[PDB]
Curated annotation (Swiss-Prot):
<feature type="repeat" description="Kelch 2">
    <location>
        <begin position="49"/>
        <end position="99"/>
    </location>
</feature>
<protein>
    <recommendedName>
        <fullName>Kelch-like ECH-associated protein 1</fullName>
    </recommendedName>
</protein>
<comment type="similarity">
    <text>Belongs to the KEAP1 family.</text>
</comment>
<feature type="repeat" description="Kelch 1">
    <location>
        <begin position="3"/>
        <end position="48"/>
    </location>
</feature>
<comment type="subunit">
    <text>(Microbial infection) Interacts with ebolavirus protein VP24; this interaction activates transcription factor NFE2L2/NRF2 by blocking its interaction with KEAP1.</text>
</comment>
<feature type="repeat" description="Kelch 3">
    <location>
        <begin position="100"/>
        <end position="146"/>
    </location>
</feature>
<feature type="repeat" description="Kelch 6">
    <location>
        <begin position="241"/>
        <end position="285"/>
    </location>
</feature>
<feature type="modified residue" description="S-cGMP-cysteine">
    <location>
        <position position="110"/>
    </location>
</feature>
<feature type="repeat" description="Kelch 5">
    <location>
        <begin position="194"/>
        <end position="240"/>
    </location>
</feature>
<comment type="subunit">
    <text>Component of the BCR(KEAP1) E3 ubiquitin ligase complex, at least composed of 2 molecules of CUL3, 2 molecules of KEAP1, and RBX1. Interacts with NFE2L2/NRF2; the interaction is direct. Forms a ternary complex with NFE2L2/NRF2 and PGAM5. Interacts with (phosphorylated) SQSTM1/p62; the interaction is direct and inactivates the BCR(KEAP1) complex by sequestering it in inclusion bodies, promoting its degradation. Interacts with NFE2L1. Interacts with BPTF and PTMA. Interacts with MAP1LC3B. Interacts indirectly with ENC1. Interacts with SESN1 and SESN2. Interacts with HSP90AA1 and HSP90AB1.</text>
</comment>
<feature type="site" description="Sensor for electrophilic agents">
    <location>
        <position position="110"/>
    </location>
</feature>
<feature type="repeat" description="Kelch 4">
    <location>
        <begin position="147"/>
        <end position="193"/>
    </location>
</feature>
<comment type="function">
    <text>Substrate-specific adapter of a BCR (BTB-CUL3-RBX1) E3 ubiquitin ligase complex that regulates the response to oxidative stress by targeting NFE2L2/NRF2 for ubiquitination. KEAP1 acts as a key sensor of oxidative and electrophilic stress: in normal conditions, the BCR(KEAP1) complex mediates ubiquitination and degradation of NFE2L2/NRF2, a transcription factor regulating expression of many cytoprotective genes.</text>
</comment>
């Protein structure tokens, strides 16, 4: 009975929605609003708890990048504040390894981070780990074989097709094979033994293409393209399928949710959010 949760986002301004989708019956739940509206945040789950990490509050008055970390408990329907990160990180990537949340890249104003920090929920503390090789914002992050992958993004000058691999036991990064397509703001997840990068922005157009990295062969391969081009999309995996939610298509903030089935290699539109939005954090619990 797991749900896909979607937190925050952007439509005219940063949003406070926490909504959940139930793929078994196609219904949506409206849950407790975020304390502070945020977009460009990342969502992850550790031990049944949903965490909303980083992002930005883009409001009528002004804009503030967020160093915040907040914890949503589905049992109690309440957000609680956690220890903040060392720096604000808008357009952040995040992965979880062994119960620890990794906050990768992102921006603070015009500073494009290569730093990486790790959150320990048992102790409510962030600690810096080794920095990435490249500054990356709008970076997609996936965890496979207890390694953390940082894919694409924007370094401050160049939009990137490069990707790198973090080794927690050695505390070191290495560059891996570059993608076929430059992508910032892509959706990045892991399904079966592969990293998928879906959509994003190549510096000219929003993309519908989708590629996957097979770790055995160290090669990126195109798979079936989404129906909508999209960047700043949310992404998750649920019962063996990839779900992509929202994003910006070049003209509209999308309410479309597409599902990818790897056995048929096809995308289908399975629901719509209650309103169109980009830059959401998404996770499953
Ligand atoms: C068009 O208006 C927008 C206003 C706000 C927003 S957002 O949803 O609040 N966040 C973001 C905005 C941009 C990002 N990088 S990008 O590569 O996708 C991109 C780059 C250039 C573009 O065109 C010139 C469009 C998208 C984001 C990346 C990750 C997460 C959030 C991003 C989205 C759209």
């Amino acid at each position: 009975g797991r749900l896909i949760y979607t937190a925050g986002g952007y439509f005219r301004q940063s949003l406070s929605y926490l909504e959940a989708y139930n793929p078994s019956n196609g219904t949506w739940l409206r849950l407790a609003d975020l304390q502070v509206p945020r977009s460009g945040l990342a969502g992850c789950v550790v031990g049944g708890l949903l965490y909303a990490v980083g992002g930005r509050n883009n409001s009528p008055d002004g804009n503030t990048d967020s160093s915040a970390l907040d914890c949503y408990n589905p049992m109690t329907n309440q957000w609680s504040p956690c220890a903040p990160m060392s720096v604000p990180r808008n357009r952040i990537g995040v992965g979880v390894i062994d119960g620890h949340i990794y906050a990768v890249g992102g921006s603070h104003g015009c500073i494009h981070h290569n730093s990486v920090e790790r959150y320990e929920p048992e102790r409510d503390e962030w600690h810096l780990v080794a920095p990435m090789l490249t500054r990356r914002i709008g970076v997609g992050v996936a965890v496979l074989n207890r390694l953390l992958y940082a894919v694409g993004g924007f370094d401050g000058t160049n939009r990137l097709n490069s990707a790198e691999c973090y080794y927690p036991e050695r505390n070191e990064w290495r560059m891996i094979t570059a993608m076929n397509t430059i992508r910032s703001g892509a959706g990045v997840c892991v399904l079966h033994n592969c990293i998928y990068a879906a959509g994003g922005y190549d510096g000219q157009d929003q993309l519908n293409s989708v590629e996957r990295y097979d770790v055995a062969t160290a090669t990126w391969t195109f798979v079936a393209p989404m129906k909508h081009r999209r960047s700043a999309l949310g992404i998750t995996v649920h019962q063996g399928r990839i779900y992509v939610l929202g994003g910006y298509d070049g003209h509209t903030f999308l309410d479309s949710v597409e599902c990818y089935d790897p056995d048929t290699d096809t995308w289908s539109e399975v629901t719509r959010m209650t309103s169109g939005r980009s830059g959401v954090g998404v996770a499953v619990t």
